[PDB]
Amino acid sequence: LTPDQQTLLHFIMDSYNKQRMPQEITNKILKEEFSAEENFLILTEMATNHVQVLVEFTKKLPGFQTLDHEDQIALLKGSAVEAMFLRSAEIFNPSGHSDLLEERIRNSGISDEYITPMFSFYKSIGELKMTQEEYALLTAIVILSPDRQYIKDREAVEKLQEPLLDVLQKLCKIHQPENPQHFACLLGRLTELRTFNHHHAEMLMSWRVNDHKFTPLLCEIWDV
Amino acid sequence: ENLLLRYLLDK
Ligand SMILES: Nc1ccc(C(=O)O[C@H]2C[C@H]3CC[C@@H]2C3)cc1
């Protein structure tokens, strides 16, 4: 529980807790007409919101400013899908309200082939009851992944990811000494989270056949 | 580039 490691963890939590879900989205989830079209508009707003907060959180990550400019974009794009589903898993696990959200998701023009593993995945996440701190570090670990396509200097990214692993690995030992494999179980969930890169490309195919409109931010972050 | 994203990173 180093000084420098405690300084880092406060920096990450300062940035993670600025990220909030506007009331206007929440209110739409609860008040708006319930149709496939309207459920899909709501999901589009949520996703647009997720990406804005992702960008905010990312730009404040220690060392992020000092990375090559193109590499910065590569990590944002490269991470968006995994980061969104991880935020989405936290958020889901609001009072119910979550039920109503779940039904909007199940009725928004998405085949169960993609709906199924999403909810399955949320349950996997829920079974570890992770802390705020763990969600935040996992999130930064995903964003700062040196394996994404197009990165020119993977070593630079690797430097920034390592200290966050160390912190995370320590927290796991402190808040889960009874299970010494907790860390490994968390890295386990990143494996499951990577599979959504493929799922989301597929579902984005389905949706564009139907000719659904995306926002500029969604179009740009996902190369639509 | 990806200009909307660069704008958002530079605020
Ligand atoms: N035009 C779009 C609207 C919604 C999404 C989306 O991914 O929604 C996210 C919210 C959670 C449910 C699906 C994902 C996770 C993508 C494109």
Determine the N-to-C terminus distance of chain A: 44 Å
Secondary-structure-based class of chain B equals: mainly alpha
Give the ordered list of helices and strands of chain A: HHHHHHHHHHH
As a whole number of angstroms, the C-alpha radius of gyration of chain A is 18 Å
The number of domains of chain A is 1
Q: Report the strand count of chain B.
A: 0
- Strand tally of chain A, please? 0
Shape of chain A: globular
Which oligomeric state applies?
heterodimer
Number of helices of chain B: 1
* Span between termini of chain B: 17 Å
Radius of gyration of chain B: 6 Å
Q: Can I get a quick summary?
A:
The complex is a heterodimer of chains A (224) and B (11). Chain A has 224 residues and is mostly helical. Chain A contains eleven helices and no strands.
Structure, described:
The complex is a heterodimer of chains A (224) and B (11). Chain A is mainly alpha-helical and 224 residues long. Chain A has a single domain, classed as Orthogonal Bundle (Retinoid X Receptor). Chain A has helices at 3-18, 23-31, 36-59, 69-92, 99-106, 112-126, 132-143, 154-175, 182-194, 196-209, 216-221. Helix content of chain B is 73%, strand content 0%. With 11 residues, chain B is mainly α. Chain B starts with a helix and ends with a helix. Classes of the chains: A mainly alpha (224), B mainly alpha (11). [(1R,2S,4S)-2-bicyclo[2.2.1]heptanyl] 4-azanylbenzoate (XD5) is lined by residues 43-44, 46-47, 84-85, 88, 105, 212, 214, 218 of chain A. Chain B: It is found in: Nucleus. Chain B: Belongs to the SRC/p160 nuclear receptor coactivator family.
Task: Kindly list the characteristics that best describe this protein.
heterodimer; A: 224 residues; mainly alpha; Retinoid X Receptor; 73% helix; 0% strand; B: 11 residues; binds [(1R,2S,4S)-2-bicyclo[2.2.1]heptanyl] 4-azanylbenzoate
Describe the protein's topology.
The complex is a heterodimer of chains A (224) and B (11).
Chain A: H1 3-18, H2 23-31, H3 36-59, H4 69-92, H5 99-106, H6 112-126, H7 132-143, H8 154-175, H9 182-194, H10 196-209, H11 216-221
Helix pairs in contact in A: 1-7, 3-4, 4-6, 4-7, 7-8
Chain B: H1 3-10
The complex binds [(1R,2S,4S)-2-bicyclo[2.2.1]heptanyl] 4-azanylbenzoate (XD5).
